[model samples]
Target: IEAIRCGGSRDCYRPCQKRTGCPNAKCINKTCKCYGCS
Candidate 1:
């Protein structure tokens, strides 16, 4: 399979939400999930 690179979560099927001082969004399982952005 070819390597697929996503520029932003918005380009994904499940784009993660935007939050500050927390986690940033989106790149897992064809979607954007929140993680420890700290």
Candidate 2:
């Protein structure tokens, strides 16, 4: 959520933020948001 609030508009989708990331399965801008897949 922090990254999205920071560099989301710039498409700063990190691989660490994916469906297989942590306990958080929240998506960002329709991207694979979590912390595993990008």
Candidate 3:
């Protein structure tokens, strides 16, 4: 799968971390599902 970039104003996926302040988050298998923020 293609890796998505997560930074700046661009929408991207990121690993869920404590207090990451991610307003939008998805989860899979009890873990954060990485996906675009768009």
Residues 1-38, model 1: lDDT tens digits: 32233666554333222333343556656544554344
Q: 1 or 3: which has the higher TM-score? A: 1
lDDT of 3 at 7: 43
Q: How does model 3 score by TM-score?
A: 0.24
lDDT of each: 0.45, 0.41, 0.38
Worst 10 residues of 1 by lDDT: 12-21
Instruction: List residue ranges in candidate 1 displaced over 4 A.
Output: 1-23, 36-38
> Across residues 1-38, which tens digit of lDDT does each residue of candidate 3 receive?
43333443223223433225453545433444443333
Least accurate 10 contiguous residues by lDDT in model 3: 9-18
Please name the candidate that would achieve the greatest TM-score relative to the true structure. Answer: 1
Q: How does candidate 2 fare on TM-score?
A: 0.22
What's the TM-score of every candidate structure?
0.26, 0.22, 0.24
Better of 1 and 3 by lDDT: 1
Report backbone clashes per prediction: 1, 6, 0
Model 2 per-residue lDDT at 22: 37
- Candidate 2 lDDT score relative to the true structure: 0.41
